[PDB]
Design a binder for these strands. Sequence first.
DNA 1: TGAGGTAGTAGGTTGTA
DNA 2: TACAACCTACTACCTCAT
Length: 745
Amino acid sequence: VSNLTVEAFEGIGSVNPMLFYQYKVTGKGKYDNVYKIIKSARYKMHSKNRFKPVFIKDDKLYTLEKLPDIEDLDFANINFVKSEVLSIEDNMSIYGEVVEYYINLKLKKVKVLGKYPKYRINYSKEILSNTLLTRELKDEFKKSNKGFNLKRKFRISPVVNKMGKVILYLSCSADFSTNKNIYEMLKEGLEVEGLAVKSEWSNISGNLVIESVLETKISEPTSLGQSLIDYYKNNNQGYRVKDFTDEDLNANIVNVRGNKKIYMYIPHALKPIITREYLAKNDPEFSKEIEQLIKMNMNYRYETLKSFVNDIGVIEELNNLSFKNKYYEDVKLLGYSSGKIDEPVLMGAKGIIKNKMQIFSNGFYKLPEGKVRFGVLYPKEFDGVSRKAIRAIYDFSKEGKYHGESNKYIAEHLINVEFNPKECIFEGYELGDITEYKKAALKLNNYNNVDFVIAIVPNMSDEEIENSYNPFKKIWAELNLPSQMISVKTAEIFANSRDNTALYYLHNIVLGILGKIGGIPWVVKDMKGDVDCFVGLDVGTREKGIHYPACSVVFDKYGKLINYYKPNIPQNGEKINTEILQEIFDKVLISYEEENGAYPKNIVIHRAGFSREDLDWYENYFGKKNIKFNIIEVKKSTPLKIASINEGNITNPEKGSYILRGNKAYMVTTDIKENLGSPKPLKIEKSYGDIDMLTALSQIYALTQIHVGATKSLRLPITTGYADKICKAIEFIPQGRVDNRLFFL
DNA sequence: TGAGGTAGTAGGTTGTA
DNA sequence: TACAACCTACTACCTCAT
Ligand SMILES: [Mn+2]
């Protein structure tokens, strides 16, 4: 079979315990403690003397070689204390920082094509290689004709163990930069407005974006208080203001919004964050070229890391520190335990389905009792194309026929819909202001003959006249009428095309079409392990000071959605209170008693982004009600990636394979073939439980495979994934009361 | 938004070592 | 205390075959 590994290179040799220098910082300046400026004074001292290292442990600063004791620094003066050999087995993070520093210092001295150093390094974990590595193993600069440049931000993070071995964890991440500035684009007259720009001089954190431009030169005193070049002289930045010439004295001021105030900077400073928005809108053939190189299978970034640690080579400063260029054989050598989870059995109306497409051909497992009466919004210029699209979706859902022709791959009466084209409601709406969208949605929903909305919206692209998607979704979720929507690209795909590449669109339309009205398309025949329900939670933190409240959901040992419940009382901060948990678990016991007449004997509580506190509430609250319970936290977005070795030639891993260490389980849930990227796996953590992670991850993978609004599987499990969707869609959900119909799908 | 995945890029907290 | 993981938002392609 195909085993799995992880982006790790074992350092050949051993890190020996070396002679360091204990430094202490004296509280000279206005700062009371030396803790909050130990990073600041750290990189100041590092900037002092030929870029020599300095490391941070809570009170003792370590340097490897004897720096001369300087006290000329204005806020802080430091003091040498003693010099001794520090033990590696007590100092893990310190010698890890030593190894990352020395591989930085060895990669600085490497040049490619003679003049050009390969890696621009600021002595951190981010090693930006100026020179790419391509598909055909050519380490070549790839620049655009328009000034764009791809680079690949290596992320080292080596850790050392108690014996002395250092393991270099890596992460390829192709980043985006340009040699141009916004002044150079002003020289060819490119429009600077609408540009997410990044100050490489001021390292403030904020979405800096261009405000405007008037005609004042930079050699004139402005609203900052003076001529800004004098403040560049004032900010200990003479080496960057000494350079620019008399034509650059004719630079025109371009101001920038750093999300709290205006900033008046020179345009020779500011460089645009050239996102894929920018690469597409300004040179799209460059984007079509580079998606072979930023969407990247395991073979390609393994080739890159092979080149990377081939370029590191060996370091004699750490006693023959060399790195292997091959991955591991298995993660058992690293500490985890691999394995593959078998696929879940899925059933529909007449029992088992072979694959996730057969449910249209045989029938759905859980239909809601009643009839689903459609109603369609569409653009007024796009009448007949929408007519053919709605005729296609209704013929598919009711009559089992596709563009009139009946076909054996689709069962009849798949959803009990009631849609008569001579009798039902069509409302053409013109693409205009958003209040026209509001009056169109209420002019549909005033008539109580509709149970489901199919709006035809414009595409997610197409900046001119914009989406009617989000105000429609807000109104149809607030009016308690679920809606599945169509971008008009898909409408002419239904009308004009004559092949199955509108039928696949139609498959995901029908799965969403039954998910929105509370039906469940398929379930498991059995969820592994003794279990009666699932509980998924999440909290959201989009910006600073914003804590989205909790959202709960319940499933069963079939995994059908019984209920998703929003708690009523608002929380306090990131970590939630106890009354929210009280009402959530009282209501989840009420809902499971409502749907099965008994209490749960097992409960697997899935969880997104909580800490291990509040667990005593779970302990006493389920000791009073004496159900054995399980709490498993699902970690959504990890920088950790996953590989798969086929006889030394390594590629993407198949879906359903996990790697596990105790309570730490990484698992890839999705299948991605090559030239499309590499699958970004999950991370699974158990805070309290009596179950092994085998049946836990089997539940995890089965609830990846029961996404109820698409033919292909979701990456997240649908407990924490659907709770995460509701925590995204916090204003779509009705507040405080129970519901079955999935709005977000 | 068909629909999910990848990827980027910006931006914040705070948990476990 | 730090700080590496964790979150979050938005686009761009790309393929879906029973
Ligand atoms: Mn949808």
